[PDB]
Amino acid sequence: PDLKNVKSKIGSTENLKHQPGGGKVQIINKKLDLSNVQSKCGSKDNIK
């Protein structure tokens, strides 16, 4: 006898393209703007 060609069915041989692929993460951080800010009591200029 002869079998010519035969192969397995179905598993890890059909998976070899798809890893799958991974990704990327990031924070999750900010600031605030302070540029407007002055004190809200204010007598010391009255020295004038």
């Binding site: 179905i10 598993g11 890890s12 059909e14 998976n15 798809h18 890893q19 799958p20 991974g22 990704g23 990327k24 993460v25 924070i27 999750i28 951080n29 600031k31």
Partner: protein
């Protein structure tokens, strides 16, 4: 005060108390803990590394794709879990950092 190094240090004072007057049946007292450690990442690490070892081989996967799930459904899921895990690393041991980068001096010899 005894255990400060097991605590996310940019979330200062990590506690919420509640105190009910009414005990468990026929007993003087109790308490209930609900904790948010990052250590929980070890379980989702396991389950992602385990999933990976079934999935890069198509183990058991015939049974679920047999109920109509597309390969994108398991890949989005795994990706989704992996993202949760990648985040948990980014919350773990972290410092109060403010996202700056290395800079250097100019010149004072104006033209």
């Amino acid at each position: 005060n005894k255990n400060s190094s097991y605590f996310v240090e940019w979330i200062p004072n990590n506690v919420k108390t509640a105190v009910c007057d009414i005990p468990p049946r026929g007993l003087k007292m109790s308490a209930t803990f609900i904790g948010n450690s990052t250590a929980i990442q070890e379980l989702f690490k396991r389950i992602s590394e385990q999933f990976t070892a079934m999935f890069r081989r198509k183990a058991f996967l015939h049974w679920y794709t047999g109920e109509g799930m597309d390969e994108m459904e398991f890949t989005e899921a795994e990706s989704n879990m992996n993202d949760l895990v990648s985040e948990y690393q980014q919350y773990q041991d972290a410092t109060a950092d403010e996202q700056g980068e290395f800079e250097e001096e100019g010149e004072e010899d104006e033209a």
